[PDB]
């Protein structure tokens, strides 16, 4: 009575190899499920993290290399362009012989980099305004510094686009780094050293004299300014309520409420916005509505920006852009970035050039690369099997509403309405394979030169930003996918109320049409429930069935949501991570993902029990003394096997909205009675605490 198929054999071998059966599952299910994987594996020198997800992504890059590196006679133009882009990227000889010349050509167009410019004040500081300098980086290169203005979806009218104003992203991974002490000290040192090294290279290439003390002076003031910006930004915990974050006002009101004096000139918000929007021939008057996400930031900015000159600001502004471009330059320039990445992420080697290039082409031509990927690597008939599993789990979500005791009836009815409305996107959009005209037209305005990698990447920057700006007066395309197909991930879009399962994640261990259903439900089923539950977490619950930010909760039910989810805030905030030197997880910043994990696993498990009821027990797996309820949880845990470099562990505690895999495993299983039943865990053993958190 044992499954002896090839697909059961490959699954069982993977399960056996990764687990450590000498650990008791009720004491540490992470080491039980992953201890064998941890023993066999070391983090690659090129990675700051390693594990199941990272391995599948590495294996996906291999497929990408295979399809991009050989031209074929039948290739449509969209495909010719992806392969040409790839070839331009991996030609290090062409890149190396240009040195930094492609950046030197570019710098005048952004008002220069003062530290690497002689007589900057005379050349650029003469006509320099904050309106023009910020807008130029924004509109031409998509780089948003000091004031982050972007065109996006209106949270309260999800079919329209609207201009937003927000705080900018920083050079270091989070605002916490700018304390620059203890665990952040080496990163801060490496960051300013990075600045200095790139300034030195540019000056050396321009044949300017190198004054090390003056380099240190100017770049430490860049850091001093950015420390102020960082401290003025709101924390993630003060941005996690989308009802509070949304503030719509007119441009007239913005001028009245957020005045700025920069380089001694009164900042004209209308002139700044028009410097950007004129790029795509759109005129803006002072009655324009604008969603301001960071009003407090703009307020604290006022005393900051009176203290700095045009030259101080431009040294930061140009550096933030140059930082993003160094990896498209010669090996000498990359060597300065390699040094900063080591200090920051703990890697000791740069990622293989072909891998970086494959990922770059994938990120910029997601539909063309997706077509090549699915034709080489994706079954196709599995699209329908996954369809049916989503059907089952969505229904499990709706049925569970009845049993929840902390919602009232009106709110349950609105929750059911939203769940029924979720659109699902599985695998890939069929027309990337069958509609050559549409695919070619997506890249029609791009033309790549095979010896001009830098020119090619600048073209992608311009083309993407101009396309985004042009959406201001257009409706949202409901047919658009929020991810390419060649992606090992899954997503939920609150604005579109849509779950997406790219083909890259529809493979073992998550899913195979020939592996045991216990594994599929513990793998892709739990992921399906995770993404559905995102529509109902501390962010998604605020958006209705059409993706509009509208309150559909009664006061009591909303209050009870907060009560139930507070349990998980304490639970995960109490986890100490050794890899991060004992620092605690942020239970607030990871709450949404933790809610999705705990809700998703329960929905998947109940769907699997339904499956057993309607179909009977599955054949056991050879070589494993586990029943299928145990295998369900074993496979769920093995999805998250992995480990982290110390440097990246402290990074991810501040920047990752997810818990680390090993606490996703321990936390959710601690909260699951069904897990402790499956493994006969004694009361109050580590994996089975008496107090258990439950939202969905």
CB of 81 to ligand NAG, least distance (A): 16
Q: Per CB under 6 A, which region of 88-96, 307-315, 336-344, 433-441 contacts ligand NAG?
A: 88-96
The 8-class DSSP code of residue 2 comes to B
Give the sign of the dihedral formed by CA 78, CA 79, CA 82, CA 85: negative
Residue 174 interacting partner from Zn ion, ligand NAG, none (CB closer than 5 to 8 Å by kind): none
Residue 596 interacting partner from Zn ion, ligand NAG, none (CB closer than 5 to 8 Å by kind): Zn ion
Which residue's beta carbon is nearest to the bound ligand NAG? 573
The 8-class DSSP code of residue 525 comes to I
Helix (H) / strand (E) containing 350: none
- Is 226 a residue that touches ligand NAG (CB under 6 A)? no
Please check whether residue 32 is in contact with residue 651, taking contact to mean a CB–CB distance below 8 angstroms.
no
User: If binding means CB under 6 A, how many residues of this protein chain bind ligand NAG?
Assistant: 18
Please check whether residue 666 is in contact with residue 687, taking contact to mean a CB–CB distance below 8 angstroms.
yes
Residue 593 interacting partner from ligand NAG, Zn ion, none (CB closer than 5 to 8 Å by kind): Zn ion
Residues with Cβ < 8 Å from 593, sequence gap 6 or more?
537, 657, 658, 659, 664
Q: 593 or 618: whose CB is closer to Zn ion?
A: 593
Q: Per CB under 6 A, which region of 164-172, 274-282, 441-449, 541-549 contacts ligand NAG?
A: 274-282
Helix residue ranges, H only, 41-150: 52-68, 77-90, 92-97, 101-106, 120-123, 130-141
> Binding string to ligand NAG for residues 387 to 426, with x set by CB under 6 A, is what?
----------------------------------------
Q: 509 or 600: whose CB is closer to Zn ion?
A: 600
541-570 binders of ligand NAG (CB under 6 A): 570
CB of 94 to ligand NAG, least distance (A): 4
How many CB atoms sit inside 10 A of residue 13's CB?
14
- Is 587 a residue that touches ligand NAG (CB under 6 A)? yes
> Binding string to ligand NAG for residues 444 to 463, with x set by CB under 6 A, is what?
-------x------------
- Is 131 a residue that touches ligand NAG (CB under 6 A)? yes
Return binding residues.
49, 530, 534, 593
Q: What are phi and psi of 620, to 5 degrees?
A: -70, 170
How far apart are the C-alpha atoms of 603 and 535, rounded to whole Å?
14
Q: 285 or 437: whose CB is closer to ligand NAG?
A: 285
Return binding residues for a peptide.
49
Q: 189 or 583: whose CB is closer to ligand NAG?
A: 583
**One of 11, 47, 117, 129 touching ligand NAG (CB under 6 A):** 129
Please check whether residue 692 is in contact with residue 601, taking contact to mean a CB–CB distance below 8 angstroms.
no
- Is 91 a residue that touches ligand NAG (CB under 6 A)? yes
Q: Per CB under 6 A, which region of 269-277, 321-329, 436-444, 638-646 contacts ligand NAG?
A: 269-277
CB of 109 to ligand NAG, least distance (A): 17
Q: Per CB under 6 A, which region of 2-10, 85-93, 246-254, 491-499 contacts ligand NAG?
A: 85-93
Q: 271 or 554: whose CB is closer to ligand NAG?
A: 271
Q: 47 or 328: whose CB is closer to ligand NAG?
A: 328
Residue 451 interacting partner from Zn ion, ligand NAG, none (CB closer than 5 to 8 Å by kind): ligand NAG
Q: 386 or 532: whose CB is closer to Zn ion?
A: 532
Residues with Cβ < 8 Å from 86, sequence gap 6 or more?
68, 69, 357, 358, 361
**One of 166, 275, 350, 597 touching ligand NAG (CB under 6 A):** 275
Active site (annotated) includes residue 324: no
How far apart are the C-alpha atoms of 79 and 442, rounded to whole Å?
11
How far apart are the C-alpha atoms of 500 and 290, rounded to whole Å?
29
Please check whether residue 374 is in contact with residue 79, taking contact to mean a CB–CB distance below 8 angstroms.
no
CB of 570 to ligand NAG, least distance (A): 4
The C-alpha angle 536, 541, 543, rounded to 5 degrees, equals: 125
CB of 497 to ligand NAG, least distance (A): 31
How far apart are the C-alpha atoms of 544 and 159, rounded to whole Å?
13
Pairing mode, strands 265-266 and 491-493: unpaired
Please report, to the nearest 10 degrees, the dihedral formed by the alpha carbons of residues 167, 172, 178, 184 taken in order.
150
Which of 531, 537, 548, 656 is catalytic? The answer is 531
DSSP letter string, 388-456: HHHHHHHHHHHHHHHH-SSS-HHHHHHHHHHHHH-EEEEE--THHHH-HHHHHHHTTT----TT-HHHH
Q: 131 or 531: whose CB is closer to Zn ion?
A: 531
Q: 199 or 527: whose CB is closer to Zn ion?
A: 527
CB of 695 to ligand NAG, least distance (A): 16
DSSP letter string, 165-211: EEPPPPSSSSGGGGG-SGGGHHHHHHHHHHHHHHHHHHHHHHTPPP-
Q: Per CB under 6 A, which region of 271-279, 363-371, 378-386, 494-502 contacts ligand NAG?
A: 271-279
Active site (annotated) includes residue 677: no
Q: 164 or 227: whose CB is closer to ligand NAG?
A: 227
Q: Per CB under 6 A, which region of 61-69, 89-97, 147-155, 343-351 contacts ligand NAG?
A: 89-97
- Is 573 a residue that touches ligand NAG (CB under 6 A)? yes
Residue 91 interacting partner from ligand NAG, Zn ion, none (CB closer than 5 to 8 Å by kind): ligand NAG
CB of 281 to ligand NAG, least distance (A): 11
- Is 655 a residue that touches ligand NAG (CB under 6 A)? no
CB of 119 to ligand NAG, least distance (A): 21
Which of 597, 618, 647, 656 is catalytic? The answer is 597
How far apart are the C-alpha atoms of 537 and 658, rounded to whole Å?
13
Q: Is 543 exposed, middle or buried (0-12, 13-18, 19+ CB in 10 A)?
A: buried
Pairing mode, strands 261-262 and 491-493: unpaired
How far apart are the C-alpha atoms of 249 and 257, rounded to whole Å?
10
CB of 593 to Zn ion, least distance (A): 5
Cα first-last separation, the chain:
36
CB of 655 to Zn ion, least distance (A): 15
Please check whether residue 102 is in contact with residue 76, taking contact to mean a CB–CB distance below 8 angstroms.
no
Q: In what order do the strands lie in the sheet with 423-427?
A: 423-427, 498-502, 491-493
Please check whether residue 133 is in contact with residue 313, taking contact to mean a CB–CB distance below 8 angstroms.
yes
Please check whether residue 293 is in contact with residue 245, taking contact to mean a CB–CB distance below 8 angstroms.
yes
- Is 282 a residue that touches ligand NAG (CB under 6 A)? no
**One of 300, 383, 658, 694 touching ligand NAG (CB under 6 A):** 300
Residues with Cβ < 8 Å from 293, sequence gap 6 or more?
164, 165, 166, 167, 239, 245, 246, 247
Question: Can you give the binding site for Zn ion, defined by CB under 5 A?
Answer: 593, 596
User: Residue numbers of the site for ligand NAG (CB under 6 A)?
Assistant: 87, 91, 93-94, 129, 131, 231, 271, 274-275, 278, 300, 451, 570, 573-574, 584, 587
Catalytic (active-site) positions: 531, 597
């Amino acid at each position: 009575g044992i499954c002896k198929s090839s697909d059961c054999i490959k699954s069982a071998a993977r399960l056996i190899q990764n687990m450590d059966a000498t650990t008791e599952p009720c004491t540490d299910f992470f080491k039980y499920a992953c201890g064998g994987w941890l023993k066999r594996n070391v983090i690659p020198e090129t990675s700051s993290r390693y594990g199941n997800f990272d391995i599948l992504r590495d294996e996906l890059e291999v497929v990408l290399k295979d399809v991009l590196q050989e031209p074929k006679t039948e290739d449509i133009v969209a495909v010719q362009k992806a392969k040409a882009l790839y070839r331009s990227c991996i030609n290090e000889s062409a890149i190396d012989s240009r040195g930094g010349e492609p950046l030197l050509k570019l710098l005048p167009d952004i008002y220069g980099w003062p530290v690497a410019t002689e007589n900057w004040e005379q050349k650029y500081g003469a006509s320099w305004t904050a309106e023009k300098a910020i807008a130029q980086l924004n509109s031409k290169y998509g780089k948003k510094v000091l004031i982050n203005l972007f065109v996006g979806t209106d949270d309260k009218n999800s079919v329209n686009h609207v201009i937003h104003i927000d705080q900018p992203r920083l050079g270091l991974p989070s605002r916490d780094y700018y304390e620059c002490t203890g665990i952040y000290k080496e990163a801060c040192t490496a960051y300013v050293d990075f600045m200095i090294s790139v300034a030195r290279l540019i000056r050396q290439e321009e044949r300017l004299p190198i004054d090390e003390n003056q380099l240190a002076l100017e770049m430490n003031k860049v850091m001093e300014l950015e420390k102020e910006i960082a401290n003025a930004t709101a924390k993630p915990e003060d941005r996690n309520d989308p009802m509070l974050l949304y503030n719509k006002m007119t441009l007239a009101q913005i001028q009245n409420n957020f005045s700025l004096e920069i380089n001694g000139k009164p900042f004209s918000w209308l002139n700044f916005t028009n410097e950007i929007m004129s790029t795509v021939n759109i005129s803006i008057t002072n009655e324009e509505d604008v969603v301001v996400y960071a009003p407090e930031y703009l307020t604290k900015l006022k005393p900051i920006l009176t203290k700095y000159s045009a030259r101080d600001l431009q040294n930061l502004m140009s550096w933030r852009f140059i930082m993003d471009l160094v990896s498209s330059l010669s090996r000498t320039y990359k060597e300065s970035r390699n040094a900063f990445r080591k200090a920051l992420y703990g890697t000791t080697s740069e990622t293989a050039t072909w891998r970086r290039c494959a990922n770059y082409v994938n990120g910029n031509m997601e539909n063309a690369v997706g077509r090549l990927y699915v034709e080489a690597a994706f079954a196709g008939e599995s699209k329908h099997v996954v369809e049916d599993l989503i059907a089952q789990i969505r229904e499990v979500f709706i049925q569970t509403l009845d049993d929840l005791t902390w919602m009232d009836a009106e709110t349950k009815k609105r929750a059911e309405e939203k769940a029924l409305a979720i659109k699902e996107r599985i695998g890939y959009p069929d027309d990337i394979v069958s509609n050559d005209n549409k695919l070619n037209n997506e890249y029609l305005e791009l033309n790549y030169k095979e010896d001009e990698y830098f020119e090619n990447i600048i073209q992608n920057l311009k083309f993407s930003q101009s396309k985004q700006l042009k959406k201001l007066r257009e409706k949202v395309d409901k047919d658009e996918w929020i991810s390419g197909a060649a992606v090992v991930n899954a997503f939920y879009s609150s604005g579109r109320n849509q779950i997406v399962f790219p083909a890259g994640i529809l493979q073992p261990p998550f899913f195979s049409a020939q592996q045991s259903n216990s594994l599929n439900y513990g793998g892709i089923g739990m992921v399906i429930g995770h993404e559905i539950t995102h529509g109902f977490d501390d962010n998604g619950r605020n958006f209705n069935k059409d993706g509009d930010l509208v309150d559909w909760w009664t006061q009591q039910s909303a209050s009870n949501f907060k009560e139930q989810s507070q349990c998980m805030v304490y639970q995960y905030g109490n986890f100490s991570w050794d890899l991060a030197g004992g620092q605690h997880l942020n239970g607030i910043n990871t709450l949404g993902e933790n809610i999705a994990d705990n809700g998703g696993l329960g929905q998947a498990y109940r769907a699997y029990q339904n499956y057993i009821k309607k179909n009977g027990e599955e054949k056991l797996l050879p070589g494993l003394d586990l029943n299928h309820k145990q295998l369900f949880f074993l496979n769920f845990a093995q999805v998250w096997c992995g480990t982290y470099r110390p440097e990246y562990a402290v990074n991810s505690i501040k920047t990752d909205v997810h818990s680390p895999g090993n606490f996703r495993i321990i936390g959710t299983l601690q909260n699951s009675a069904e897990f402790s039943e499956a493994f006969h865990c004694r009361k109050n053993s580590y994996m089975n605490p008496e107090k258990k958190c439950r939202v969905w």
